[PDB]
Amino acid sequence: RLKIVTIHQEPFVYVKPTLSDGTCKEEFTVNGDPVKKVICTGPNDTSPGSPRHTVPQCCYGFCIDLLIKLARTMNFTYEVHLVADGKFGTQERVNNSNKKEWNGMMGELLSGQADMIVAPLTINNERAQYIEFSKPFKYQGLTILVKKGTRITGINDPRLRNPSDKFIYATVKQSSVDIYFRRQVELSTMYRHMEKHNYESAAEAIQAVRDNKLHAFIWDSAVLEFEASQKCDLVTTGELFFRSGFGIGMRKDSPWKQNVSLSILKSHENGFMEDLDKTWVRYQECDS
Ligand SMILES: N[C@H](CNC(=O)C1=[SH]CC(Cc2ccccc2)=C1)C(=O)O
């Protein structure tokens, strides 16, 4: 049985409690089809002070539908869990030494706590040094989320490039967003500003934008465009940048890679990804 690791990230992965009986609530799409749900174990509370308890939860969304298809197509069984530290994955020092390790899903995949990462996981060369990716299952980029009415053009807007305290922007901790900001000369000063204010999760950053505590949130367009389309008070602004894909993650020299990529190819070829888009990404007007 493959150990699949994933992360809470709407609309790709929804995470909800079980009912009192341990079952997942019966739900239907707008088209009337049952929402496919899998059990996923993971931490139930992320609040500072609150104890961690790893409990069965209910998972569903674009990525779970993709998983279900993959497992059928390639004839594997699986069990899903949520990444224990809540992170996508960057490199960090081990015990403040010069040796480095990955945190997040990257870290679990490398340690064997997972066999496959099935998530909105950005393909990039830093991570590709350590793991294999499928071909992209979705093409996307970064964009910026703001409150409706905020006057920002994009990543080269002087309010970002020449920041005062009057305008706070941020991304998510231990995602690939920081290092690619660091590695750019034109964006080094933004990395300096942001590492001070970054959020533990996308959900918390989004909420901070709604609550006027964060003026701009830099994050995946596949996510922010959905969020802004679901919430009438939030918008995205500027051109996509750092265009890149989401891929399935596997250990180097995994025997699964070729067949995973072939599955993803078929899904781009035959309308399946577009069907998923129509189920999870664009289907109704804002209401949340
Ligand atoms: N999906 C999340 C967050 N998204 C990111 O970290 C991103 S999206 C684009 C980007 C930079 C880049 C530049 C060139 C080539 C590839 C990526 C970083 C993750 O996996 O941590």
From Swiss-Prot:
Q: Which residues are glycosylated?
A: 44, 75, 95, 162, 259
Q: Does the keyword Ion transport apply?
A: yes
Cysteine pairs forming cystine bridges in this chain are 24-58, 40-59, 232-286
**Superkingdom of this protein's organism:** Eukaryota
Enumerate the residues binding glycine. 120, 122, 127, 176, 220
Where's it mainly located? membrane
Any one GO cellular component localisation term in the record: monoatomic ion channel complex
Q: Which GO terms describe its molecular function?
A: amyloid-beta binding; calcium ion binding; calmodulin binding; glutamate binding; glutamate-gated calcium ion channel activity; glycine binding; glycine-gated cation channel activity; ligand-gated sodium channel activity
Q: Might you name a Gene Ontology BP term for this protein?
A: protein heterotetramerization
**Keyword annotations of the record:** Calcium, Cell membrane, Disease variant, Disulfide bond, Epilepsy, Glycoprotein, Intellectual disability, Ion channel, Ion transport, Ligand-gated ion channel, Magnesium, Membrane, Metal-binding, Phosphoprotein, Postsynaptic cell membrane, Receptor, Signal, Synapse, Transmembrane, Transmembrane helix, Transport, Zinc
Coiled coil location = none
Q: How is it modified after translation?
A: NMDA is probably regulated by C-terminal phosphorylation of an isoform of GRIN1 by PKC. Its phosphorylated state is influenced by the formation of the NMDAR-PPP2CB complex and the NMDAR channel activity.
Cellular location(s): Cell membrane; Postsynaptic cell membrane; Postsynaptic density membrane; Synaptic cell membrane
Q: Which residues lie on this side of the membrane: Extracellular?
A: 151-288
Q: How does it assemble?
A: Heterotetramer; the NMDAR subunits are modular and harbor tiered domains that function in concert to regulate opening and closing of the cation-selective ion channel pore. Forms heterotetrameric channels composed of two GluN1/zeta subunits (GRIN1), and two identical GluN2/epsilon subunits (GRIN2A, GRIN2B, GRIN2C or GRIN2D) or GluN3 subunits (GRIN3A or GRIN3B) (in vitro). Can also form heterotetrameric channels that contain at least two GluN1 subunits and at least two different GluN2 subunits (or a combination of one GluN2 and one GluN3 subunits) (in vitro).
Q: What is known of its domains?
A: A hydrophobic region that gives rise to the prediction of a transmembrane span does not cross the membrane, but is part of a discontinuously helical region that dips into the membrane and is probably part of the pore and of the selectivity filter. The extracellular N-terminal domain (NTD) is a site of allosteric regulation to modulate overall receptor function.
Annotated disease: Neurodevelopmental disorder with or without hyperkinetic movements and seizures, autosomal dominant: An autosomal dominant neurodevelopmental disorder characterized by severe intellectual disability and developmental delay, absent speech, muscular hypotonia, dyskinesia, and hyperkinetic movements. Cortical blindness, cerebral atrophy, and seizures are present in some patients.
| Protein family | Belongs to the glutamate-gated ion channel (TC 1.A.10.1) family. NR1/GRIN1 subfamily.
State its role: Component of N-methyl-D-aspartate (NMDA) receptors (NMDARs) that function as heterotetrameric, ligand-gated cation channels with high calcium permeability and voltage-dependent block by Mg(2+). NMDARs participate in synaptic plasticity for learning and memory formation by contributing to the long-term potentiation (LTP). Channel activation requires binding of the neurotransmitter L-glutamate to the GluN2 subunit, glycine or D-serine binding to the GluN1 subunit, plus membrane depolarization to eliminate channel inhibition by Mg(2+).
What is the name attached to this protein's record?
Answer: Glutamate receptor ionotropic, NMDA 1
Protein source organism: Homo sapiens (Human)
Q: List the gene name.
A: GRIN1
Residues included from the entire protein: 397 to 800 of 938
